[PDB]
Design a protein around this ligand. Structure first.
Ligand SMILES: [Cl-]
Ligand SMILES: [Cl-]
Ligand SMILES: [Cl-]
Ligand code: NA
Length: 128
């Protein structure tokens, strides 16, 4: 499923992401845009053999199991395929654990490079 901008903002707020760990809703929508273009089925193979999955491009090296990342962990304790669902609950719950591990949203390189320090409230402006 490709979410609309306001539709994802609402679903993210629905699931407790707005101001989670102090990161306003605009930050998560902005990150989703540049990670996945709002597509839950997005996947991207990394150099190290790991793979990013879903709306927030959550990586198999640490966070989910795909059975093909030698020496990886599964700290969200989910199959990576659950991160590709039209229902964003598993991506949101895993995102909560990633953003709590010390680096905040810098864990998403695309957020640091493309959302950090910008006017992220524009990404929810006009939405209900
Ligand atoms: Cl915001
Ligand atoms: Cl694996
Ligand atoms: Cl932080
Ligand atoms: Na893994």
């Amino acid at each position: 499923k490709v979410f609309g901008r306001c539709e994802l903002a609402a679903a993210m707020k629905r699931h407790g992401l707005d101001n989670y760990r102090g990161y306003s809703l605009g930050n998560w929508v902005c990150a989703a845009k540049f990670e996945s273009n709002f597509n839950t089925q997005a996947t991207n193979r990394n150099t190290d053999g790991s793979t990013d999955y879903g709306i927030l491009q959550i990586n198999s090296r640490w966070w989910c199991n795909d059975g093909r990342t030698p020496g990886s962990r599964n700290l969200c304790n989910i199959p990576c395929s659950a991160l590709l669902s039209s229902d964003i609950t598993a991506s949101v719950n895993c995102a909560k654990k990633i953003v709590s591990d010390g680096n905040g949203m810098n864990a998403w390189v695309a957020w640091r490079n493309r959302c950090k320090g910008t006017d992220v409230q524009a990404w929810i402006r006009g939405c209900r």
